[PDB]
Structure 1
Amino acid sequence: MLTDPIADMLTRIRNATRVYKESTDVPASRFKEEILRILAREGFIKGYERVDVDGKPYLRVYLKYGPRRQGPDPRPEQVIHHIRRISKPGRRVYVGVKEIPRVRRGLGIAILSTSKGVLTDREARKLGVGGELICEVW
């Protein structure tokens, strides 16, 4: 069974993007959906939608890359260079508002799940709350 569905999703995307796929599917879950809304809203992914693959609910995530490049290896740059789980079963990580980190001086983001819902580190900071440091992205 999947031991950590969020870690899984983050990875499917890590994997899919590294071989430049058009998109990738991930088992559907409300929580995962709230996280995708961030990724989309922040411009890491074109967006995502709810498809039903072989009778079961999935979320097609449409990935996003840069332009083709010059020289040896014309592979596009990644939009999502990095994306790593922070809190995980076995080692849950919670932060207070004064402890929310600053991913790459702001050039990146940290998705945390608060009692006010899933928020980026800037969002959560404004709202003035903290919670579980879900992941990190840049």
Structure 2
Amino acid sequence: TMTDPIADFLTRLRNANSAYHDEVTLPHSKLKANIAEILKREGYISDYRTEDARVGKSLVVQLKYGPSRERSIAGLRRVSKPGLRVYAKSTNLPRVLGGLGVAIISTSSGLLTDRQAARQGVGGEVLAYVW
């Protein structure tokens, strides 16, 4: 069955990115929408929107490609997963690509990046890495 919706979202993104698709659709949830917001604000995707599906709602994500058809996402990894979950204190927040990437962290103040969490002095669950 489906165990990790977040990992499934990340793999849909990765598979669409590798195939140079301009569009990826998935079932909607608040967590997926929030990490989509973080991705868009960090400039990793072009834009996203939510339609309505036959049963629930869908998530529509536009992938960003450069003028020479070069992908704007180099990698997407799921860090904390069902089973072995990962939590980081405000001081040992992970660095992605030596700071060139973004680590999404679920803190009690919402979804933040590693730099935002470090600035606000909070910890939480390390959802994923983007670079």
Same fold, judged at TM 0.5 (above):
yes
Corresponding residue for 2:119?
Answer: 126
- Uncovered stretches (5+) of structure 1, i.e. residues with no partner: 69-75
Match of 1:81 among 42, 60, 74: 74
Give the count of matched residue pairs: 131
Give, in angstroms, the shift of residue 56 of structure 1: 2.8
Inter-partner Cα distance in structure 2 for 1:20 and 1:51: 22
SS at match of 2:8: helix
Structure 2 unaligned regions, length at least 5 = none
**Partner of residue 92, structure 1:** 85
After superposition, residues 1-138 of structure 1 pair within 5 angstroms as 1-68=1-68, 76-138=69-131
Which structure's CA Rg is the greater one?
A: 1
User: Residue 90 of structure 1 aligns to which amino acid in structure 2?
Assistant: G
Measure how far apart 1:102 and its partner are.
Answer: 1.3
Q: Report the Cα offset of residue 55 of structure 1.
A: 4.1
Identical counterparts, % of pairs: 51
Note the C-alpha offset of 1:108.
0.7
Deviation (angstroms), 1:64? 0.7
Structure 1 distance, partners of 2:60, 2:108, is 27
Which amino acid is 2:28 matched to?
Answer: A
CA RMSD of aligned residues (A): 1.0
Mapped to 1, the partners of 2:93 and 2:77 lie a distance apart of: 16
Amino acid at match of 1:104: L
1:45-91 Cα distance to aligned partner (Å, 9 max, x none): 011001123343111011111222xxxxxxx2211110100000011
* Equivalent-residue separation in structure 2 for 1:30 and 1:55 (angstroms): 16
